[PDB]
Design a protein around this nucleic acid. Sequence first.
DNA 1: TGCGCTGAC
DNA 2: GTCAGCGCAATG
Length: 206
Amino acid sequence: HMPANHFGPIPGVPVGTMWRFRVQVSESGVHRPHVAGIHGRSNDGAYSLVLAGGYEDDVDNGNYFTYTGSGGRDLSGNKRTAGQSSDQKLTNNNRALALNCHSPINEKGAEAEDWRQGKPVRVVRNMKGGKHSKYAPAEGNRYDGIYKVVKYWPERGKSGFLVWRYLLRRDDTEPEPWTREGKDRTRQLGLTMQYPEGYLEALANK
DNA sequence: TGCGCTGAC
DNA sequence: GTCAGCGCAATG
């Protein structure tokens, strides 16, 4: 098993792989947290993240995307999601993603000096991101490859509350699964949606 | 809309 | 131990 702090691609899991549920993506090692959008360690960096349309400030343009940090929410009442209700902070997961940027951690945001030297982040796109993105898969989760953090900065989001934003750019030798070349690669690799054992059965009989 | 669960600390 | 949390096959 790859360690939890493994940076980079997971051996045996090619770009284009698909899983129906987040828990499955977690077991693959691609994105360990089954809920959180970012998997990171505040004093190391972020190993992966998921675009699932959970934050209104996310902007997905394929090879480039602006990701939103987590937090700035009031999850009281034993919740896991809510609208913005407070300013986000460059701590925990947000500090982790910032560390991937090839530049000294800056409390006011920073820009990378040769973004390609930054730490790699595995990116997964979820179907729920399809309401505001033409790159999200129609179903489940899809591993889209390695991206790097070009820069990050704070600014008020659509809600009026401060949010941390990150510009990610793809840096992977395998083709993007959404392009013509990528769909051919997926076909060539024979990749198909991974469902839990007995899921389809419980779906049909249902 | 709240629960069981997992990773970070 | 405590807390964060881009889930969800659930439930009204």
